[PDB]
């Protein structure tokens, strides 16, 4: 079992330096780069007593790359993998895909192929990016189209950071997301979304951290994406590989946007006072405010969800928990897939970063759940997009790059084509 990761844009490298911070701590790998089969899916054996990561951090702006090259994890990452551009995308899907993308995709694609040649058990890929940025929206759309025509059959996990309803970092981020989703729809097998404001109230309420940064955020997101691949690393009573999440979550080829939520998220002083068990965590993840995406689940119906656990958790009490959750009438499962449960257990417990706000817990759980609760978000993104598209605002840059109103018009009706079938299956 092997899988190659790729991080794009400002959002990717903050996920890169954080998510790889705990992997080397999980396998007992010191930061210098050295200390039997669990680390094979993310670290190769470089001759004798040295490792190297299976990742590519591409970014147009080198302001993040030189920081990592001059950071503390210098001896770990390959200097060739830290790819550098020439100039930033400027929150332009057109500039990050067509002008700046084409003159560097020939180097990035050849770099991906030569690393994939020596692989033998390459299960798939996982992409880290954000449609609200320029490099994460433009350059990621280029490689996904160019590698899908090459490989195609292999799986892909798109970990994209989406915009919030009222919170927003930029103004052109609807234009970045509306264009790239037209290309990401047909080639991305499954994309797990993340919201920026959804993390804000989580740490404020549960972790009671009133001045964190991205380093606290990405440490949690890095732990979330470590649990989904934890079955392949360490042994488990009921293991699941990378192809398991492609079938039991994507019933239709275009409806491939599951929500995500994670629990328990308890502070240090609060962990000793709170009783850790299977019942409260199994109820906490289905709680609507405890999600990584601010979308009302009660406005729709759930299609299917997977209950992947960690640590010494017996398989019986988890079956009783999902059985009790089925009886709760506060939620409502759709009649098209009522038995949409997928239990999973792993023996290796959750790790802990030294000095981090997250506390040690003997058991944890991660959730990916397909539902019709995302259609209200796309409806909101279309309405706010119509305000700017009507006035033709922030359009002279894209056509100044080379685009035109045609693909902008095709991108608008594509969401309308996505609005109808989410409401149809929601019946």
């Amino acid at each position: 079992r092997e899988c190659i990761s790729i991080h794009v844009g400002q959002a990717g490298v903050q996920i890169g330096n954080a998510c790889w911070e705990l992997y080397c701590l999980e396998h007992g790998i010191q930061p210098d780069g050295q200390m039997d089969d669990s680390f094979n899916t993310f670290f190769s054996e470089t001759g004798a007593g040295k490792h190297v990561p299976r990742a590519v951090f591409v970014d147009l702006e080198p302001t993040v790359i030189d920081e990592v090259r001059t950071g503390t994890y210098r001896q770990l990452f390959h200097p060739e993998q830290l790819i550098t551009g020439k100039e930033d995308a400027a929150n332009n899907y057109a500039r990050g895909h067509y002008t700046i993308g084409k003159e560097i995709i020939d180097l990035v694609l050849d770099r991906i192929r030569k690393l994939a040649d020596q692989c033998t058990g390459l299960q798939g890929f996982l992409v880290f990016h954000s449609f609200g940025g320029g490099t994460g929206s433009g350059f990621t759309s280029l490689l996904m189209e160019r590698l899908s025509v090459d490989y195609g059959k292999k799986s892909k996990l798109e970990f994209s950071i989406y915009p919030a309803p009222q919170v927003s970092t930029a103004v052109v981020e609807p234009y970045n997301s509306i264009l790239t989703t037209h290309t990401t729809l047909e080639h991305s097998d499954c994309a797990f979304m993340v919201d920026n404001e959804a993390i804000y109230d989580i740490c404020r309420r549960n972790l009671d951290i009133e001045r964190p940064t991205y380093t606290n955020l990405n440490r949690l997101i890095g732990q979330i994406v470590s649990s989904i691949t934890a079955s392949l690393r360490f042994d488990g009573a009921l293991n699941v590989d990378l192809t398991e999440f492609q079938t039991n979550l994507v019933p239709y080829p275009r409806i491939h946007f599951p929500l995500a939520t994670y629990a328990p998220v308890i502070s240090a002083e609060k962990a000793y006072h709170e009783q850790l068990s299977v019942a409260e965590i199994t109820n906490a993840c289905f709680e609507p405010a405890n999600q990584m995406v601010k979308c009302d689940p009660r406005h729709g119906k759930y299609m299917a969800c997977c209950l992947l656990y960690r640590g010494d958790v017996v398989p019986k009490d988890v079956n009783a928990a999902i059985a009790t959750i089925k009886t709760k009438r506060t939620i409502q499962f759709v009649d098209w897939c009522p038995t949409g449960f997928k239990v999973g257990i792993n023996y290796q417990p959750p790790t802990v970063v030294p000095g981090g706000d997250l506390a040690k817990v003997q058991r944890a759980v991660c959730m990916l759940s397909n539902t019709t609760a995302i259609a209200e978000a796309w409806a909101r993104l279309d309405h706010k997009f119509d305000l700017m598209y009507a006035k033709r605002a922030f359009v002279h840059w894209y056509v100044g790059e080379g685009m035109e109103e045609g693909e902008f018009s095709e991108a608008r009706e594509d969401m309308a084509a996505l609005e109808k079938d989410y409401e149809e299956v929601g019946v």
């Binding site: 293991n239 039991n248 299917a304 398989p315 059985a323 009522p338 449960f341």
Partner: protein
Amino acid sequence: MREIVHIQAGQCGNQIGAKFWEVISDEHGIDPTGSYHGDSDLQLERINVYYNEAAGNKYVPRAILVDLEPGTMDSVRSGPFGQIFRPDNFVFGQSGAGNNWAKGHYTEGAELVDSVLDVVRKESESCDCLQGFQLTHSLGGGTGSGMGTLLISKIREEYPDRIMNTFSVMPSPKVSDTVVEPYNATLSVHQLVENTDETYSIDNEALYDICFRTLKLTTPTYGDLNHLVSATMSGVTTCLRFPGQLNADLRKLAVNMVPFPRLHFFMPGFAPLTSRGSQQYRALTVPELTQQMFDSKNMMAACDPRHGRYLTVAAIFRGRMSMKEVDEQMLNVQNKNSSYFVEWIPNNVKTAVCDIPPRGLKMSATFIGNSTAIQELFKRISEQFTAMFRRKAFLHWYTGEGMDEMEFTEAESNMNDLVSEYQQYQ
């Protein structure tokens, strides 16, 4: 003389089979390395029916372990008796099935069947005369359900007269550890109902219920559940492993239990079942076991036998006991509860006894019953199959592997037929 070859398809098949060699090796007195340290000379006669003699007084089993993921082979190899298995039988692919019946049966499994078909040719030639194949798989998932039922069809083409005994564990409504259970179950039973002449339907709901009422286990893991099902697999194949006053071959139960060729889905069970905190307060006599034998909550199936009628049942006792009180007990259960037995058969009970019980116990038995209560299990999974199939949900991945929706409709035609077969004789 009457050898048996063990096959272990799927993740559950490797784990359920690893415990089967665990328990029978104890009563036979086999070392973890492979040597013999038994206490009685009677254990040495019929060792060839499951093991092969080797140099240095070493013995090796005929276990055909097959799976599509290498994790199960490494874990079983590091088990208590992982080293006794021969390494060449551990054939395995690289990519798992991902709970897809189409991959492990047409595309992903076909790359592996050519490697295992030549291995069973070697093991089938080493024995004097094979009696029947003891396969173990699970309807849940794609590996054991897809690739396990494939070689059932291929081996039956080679041996159109030998016995094909399978210990198939099925899904259940409340215990649903996988979303693709009805589709994998519906396609597998289309082949198992036609090819295999014997089938032992096991349900995980009963395995959780059986350990609550009588064992009182507060943290029962998978290892605790495997001890129950492994003892039933050992109890049925005990008469042709030790001598007794009335020895019943595996085929002699098939002739008595299978009045029609498709009607072969049996109800497994086991006795005695007592916790450590109440072992002294229970009587080990035959009247105590027989009442607990046909109890409504004793078998390894969730369906209530009170909602059906037994067409035929068997109680292969095991251990030194008087068979006079045995026959009086089997006479009382059919006479006192005659409403729960078919009137168009005079005697629905089979008998068999053995002299040498397992280690630690004095008298025991194993239950095998073909009843009409199992139709409630086949119809509820069909309702789960019918609910999702009518919208063609979770089928586009099957069509990618060269499948078609017509075979799903044909599988439904076999599903609704066999449940009506039970309704006829009810």
